[PDB]
Each structure stands twice: as structure tokens, then as C-alpha cells.
Amino acid sequence: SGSDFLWPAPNEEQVTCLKMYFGHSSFKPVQWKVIHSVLEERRDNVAVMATGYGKSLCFQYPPVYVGKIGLVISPLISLMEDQVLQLKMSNIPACFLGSAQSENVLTDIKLGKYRIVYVTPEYCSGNMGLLQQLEADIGITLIAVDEAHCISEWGHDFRDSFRKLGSLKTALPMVPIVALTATASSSIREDIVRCLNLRNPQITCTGFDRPNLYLEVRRKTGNILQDLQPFLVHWEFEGPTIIYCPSRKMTQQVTGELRKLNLSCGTYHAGMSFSTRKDIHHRFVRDEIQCVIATIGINKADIRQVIHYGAPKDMESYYQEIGRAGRDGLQSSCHVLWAPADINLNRHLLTEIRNEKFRLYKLKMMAKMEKYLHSSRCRRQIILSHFEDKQVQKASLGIMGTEKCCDNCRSRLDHC
Numbered sequence: 001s002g003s004d005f006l007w008p009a010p011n012e013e014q015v016t017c018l019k020m021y022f023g024h025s026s027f028k029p030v031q032w033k034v035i036h037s038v039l040e041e042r043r044d045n046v047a048v049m050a051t052g053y054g055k056s057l058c059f060q061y062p063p064v065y066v067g068k069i070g071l072v073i074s075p076l077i078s079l080m081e082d083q084v085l086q087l088k089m090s091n092i093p094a095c096f097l098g099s100a101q102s103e104n105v106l107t108d109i110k111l112g113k114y115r116i117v118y119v120t121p122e123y124c125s126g127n128m129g130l131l132q133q134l135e136a137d138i139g140i141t142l143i144a145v146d147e148a149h150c151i152s153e154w155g156h157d158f159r160d161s162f163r164k165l166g167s168l169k170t171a172l173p174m175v176p177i178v179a180l181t182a183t184a185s186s187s188i189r190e191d192i193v194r195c196l197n198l199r200n201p202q203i204t205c206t207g208f209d210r211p212n213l214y215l216e217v218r219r220k221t222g223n224i225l226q227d228l229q230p231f232l233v234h235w236e237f238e239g240p241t242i243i244y245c246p247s248r249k250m251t252q253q254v255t256g257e258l259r260k261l262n263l264s265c266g267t268y269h270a271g272m273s274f275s276t277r278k279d280i281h282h283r284f285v286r287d288e289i290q291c292v293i294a295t296i297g298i299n300k301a302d303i304r305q306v307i308h309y310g311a312p313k314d315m316e317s318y319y320q321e322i323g324r325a326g327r328d329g330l331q332s333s334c335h336v337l338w339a340p341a342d343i344n345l346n347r348h349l350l351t352e353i354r355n356e357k358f359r360l361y362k363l364k365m366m367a368k369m370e371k372y373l374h375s376s377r378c379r380r381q382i383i384l385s386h387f388e389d390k391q392v393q394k395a396s397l398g399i400m401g402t403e404k405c406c407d408n409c410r411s412r413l414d415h416c
């Protein structure tokens, strides 16, 4: 599935380059997001990959595709040497530039015969003029900064050699920087953005299996209150709850039905003003309202229940929307209530799209969402297979296959 579930769609030359130089058949969603932002928007990136794997493609692919140069700053010397070896095994010219390197290799770099150049932060801070000449003559596709959290003095593994990296954006303001890390700390990420002088960067955070989230899919009965009664205990939810609806009309229907039971809840849609949405968010965090019925950023630490009333839009929005739950690490649940006649499964609503690539993309996303909803397989396995590479999937242990994972694992443990 090279360009199946990705928008903008990777063109056929890009898929060819991927298959031929990296041996992969498709881009993972976050990989394509980073690569496309770098290639088309020249935009800085802060990329958190929780498990640590799956970040090599993000900074190796763009300079190979465009045929220019890519700089990789890292302190992990043995890893950089192994990656140089692996790249040269794939007919990708790459080298680990340092102080003890021949001027033959240096002029080869200046002539643009190396696709990827690995350097230490010390050497990088010691030779900014070389980097500027490389940008002027060849053109630097991106500058990757691995272990970027080391630039934060507030973190555990601060390295002084990262400090001077603050000058990069000063000397090459048009060259995008891709700062990669494995920590999800918001303050660490703010420090990375600040010290690297990044300009409105795209921030991605992926690589989780979220063991504290239980997944389940149920069919609608047609009656809103009958559908939502199992989530209630005068009447109230078991905890702070978000209900995602596909439209504002269904949002209002659900809100009125819940308020028939004197439930403390509030609506959250784009048709309201900024102040009203901020007030609803503040009252949700303060627990004055127990439930938010929304059509989509709701940031709250102790969300115990997410309910999609209706089939979600696609796997990406569903991913982002159930990710809001259980941020405190405590047990939470994510239920989808769906029916084949739901709006987000209506292909007739796509017949008017003019861009044929976009029409195919919408059809593919709709079909994949329906196949997830109808599947008897492990929901978490489906999500991780769609979003993460195999190495990230295998790093997940302790949740998949247990009765706290999803409804299908639970049914396969119970009598069949």
C-alpha cells in the first residue's frame, strides 16, 4: 500500500525511490507527514518516537529522493557508523565526517557526492562555514538532530555539546531542522523548540501502545439513550467522558438526550466562539461538567471514557481522538458505537469530489475504517500495524492478547 492511505498522495517516483533504496513498500503515516513537510514546506519538525525505532527513514529519505545532501547530528558514534554501513550497503553514498578525515572525503562532500553526512555536535559547531558552503553549492535538504532532548538543561542527559547547536538556525535559516527524541515531556519539547530556535515546527508524537486503554466496538441499537445507558450509573458517567459525534446535529441530539437525565455535559463544536469553547474546556478540566459532546483539542489528564457515537471519520482522526483518554496512566476505555448506515461510511457523499486522487483517498480511508469496525482481530494490533513499523509493534508487550486489551482479545479468551 504505497500511496493508499496517505494525503497528499506520494507520487510514483517517490514510491519507486522508497522501494529501491530502502526496501520498503509504503510510508508509515507519521513518516510521510515528516517527509512531506520537509520536502514541500521546508518546515522544522519536532518528532517524538516513544519506542526509539522508526526515525531513520524520516531524515534519510528526503536527501536520497531529491539527490542533495542531508546532515545528521548525533553523539551516538557507533550507531552512526552502523547506519553509514547500512546506507552504503543500499548503494546510498554516506559518510561519518569528523576531524580525522581525509581532505579527499571533504572535497567529495563539497562536490555533492555524499547523500548523508553524520557528524558530532562538537564538529558541527566547529565547522559552520563548511555547512554554509554545502548549503550554497549543493543545498541541504534537512538537518537532523538525534537525541535532541540532550539540549535541555532541565532533562536527565544534558550534553554541553548541544548548546552551540542554537546557532544552526541562525546560519541556515532556510534549512529545516528535524529534532528527534523519545521522551514525551512537554517541557522537554518546549526546550527543544526554544534552544534550537525552530520556526513554527510541525510537532508529532507517536510510537505508543497505550496499555491503559481498553478498546471495544459495538453496534448501535438506534436509540441514543439505550446505546448510552451502559456507560451510566442521580445519573452520571463513571468518569470524565468525551463523546465524539460526526455532526453538530447529532451532537445536539445526544446532548439533549443526556440532559433528559439531568447529566452535567457541554457541547464543543466549531460553530461556537473561541471564548465559549475555552469556557467549556475549562469547566471540563475543573470537573464542573462530566461529559463533553464534541465535533472536532480537548486536553485533560483524567479522561476515563471516550465514545465515538457513529463511525469515526478515518483511522487518523480516530487515533488522535482516542489518544486524548487516560493521559494520567490510569485505566480508561474507548468505545465506538457504529452502524453501516453512518455518515462516515456513506460512499455517496464522495461522488462529487473532483480530484480523483482525493476521491480514491477518501474511499480507501472509509473502507479501512469499516474493516476495522467489522474486524474480529485485535483492535490494538490493527492500529499498531497501520501506524507503526514492525519493530515498534514487537516492542509492545504486556497488553496485547490479554483481557484488558480489547473486546476481541477478551472474546478469544472467553469460551468460543
Ligand SMILES: Cc1ccc(CC(=O)N2CC[C@H](NC(=O)CCn3c(=O)[nH]c4ccccc43)[C@H](C(=O)N[C@H](CC3CCCCC3)C(=O)N(C)C)C2)c(F)c1
Pocket (backbone or CB within 6 Å): 029, 030, 033, 184, 203, 204, 205, 206, 207, 208, 209, 210, 213, 316, 317, 319, 320, 321, 322, 323, 324, 325, 327, 380, 383, 384
Ligand atoms: C493503541 C493506541 C491507541 C491510540 C494511540 C494514539 C495516542 O495514544 N495518542 C496520544 C499521543 C499523540 N497525541 C498528542 O500528542 C496530542 C496530545 N496528547 C493526547 O491527547 N494524549 C497524549 C498522551 C501523551 C502525549 C500527548 C498526548 C497521538 C497523536 O495523535 N499524534 C499526532 C501525530 C500524527 C497522528 C495521526 C497519524 C500521523 C501522526 C500528533 O502528534 N499530533 C500533534 C496530532 C495520539 C496510540 F498511540 C496507540
Ligand SMILES: [Zn+2]
Pocket (backbone or CB within 6 Å): 378, 379, 380, 381, 400, 401, 402, 405, 406, 407, 408, 409
Ligand atoms: Zn487486543
